[PDB]
Design a protein around this ligand. Structure first.
Ligand code: FE
Length: 186
């Protein structure tokens, strides 16, 4: 029984219900994320930016079942091309816009990774990715507007791979949290 989340706190409560079991109804999770109307006052505590790159701000650890985090993208900040470590990954825009570029998994042959598609994710929209869909890069291409996004990963993961667009070669990278539960974590 999916009801509209009234607030971020209500969304979190609903997510704990949707992840109470061992499987994930992706379409329901995506729908409830989309239905939460971003309210900046509710997530200001987590919106901690860094001047030089995007930050990852942990909001909730789920039932051990998921990481819910807010990513804060300064103007021009973007990610590597990366995978999602065999997890579901949902990305909902809370403020601004992000460009998502999709790539196929590289072949063993060292070649340039050519994008398969791109799209512009707009405020309140929720995208979904997993490794079977492909790899992606997420960018705030704005020169004037920060972006803020709400990400949910299940199962949680703390490492992923970055892919070199020139060759397809990958390297393992550990996620660092800029803050946890509103507290800066140097
Ligand atoms: Fe991603």
């Amino acid at each position: 029984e999916l009801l509209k989340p009234r607030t971020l706190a209500d969304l979190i409560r609903i997510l704990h219900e949707l992840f109470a079991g061992d499987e994930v109804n992706v379409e329901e999770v995506q729908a409830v994320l989309e239905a939460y109307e971003s309210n900046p006052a509710e997530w200001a505590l987590y919106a901690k930016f860094d001047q030089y790159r995007y930050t990852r701000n942990l909001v909730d650890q789920g039932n051990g079942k998921f990481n819910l985090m807010i990513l804060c993208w300064g103007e021009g900040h973007g990610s590597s091309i990366h995978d999602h470590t065999d997890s579901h990954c949902f990305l909902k825009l809370l403020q601004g816009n992000l460009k998502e570029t999709l790539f196929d998994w590289p072949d063993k042959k060292s070649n340039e990774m050519i994008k398969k598609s791109e799209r512009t994710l707009r405020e309140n929209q929720c995208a979904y990715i997993n490794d079977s869909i492909g790899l992606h890069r997420v960018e705030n291409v704005s020169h004037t507007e920060p972006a803020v996004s709400l990400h949910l990963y299940s199962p949680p993961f703390d490492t992923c791979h970055a892919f070199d667009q020139r060759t397809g070669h990958k390297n393992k990278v550990t996620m660092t949290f800029h803050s946890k539960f509103g507290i800066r974590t140097p």
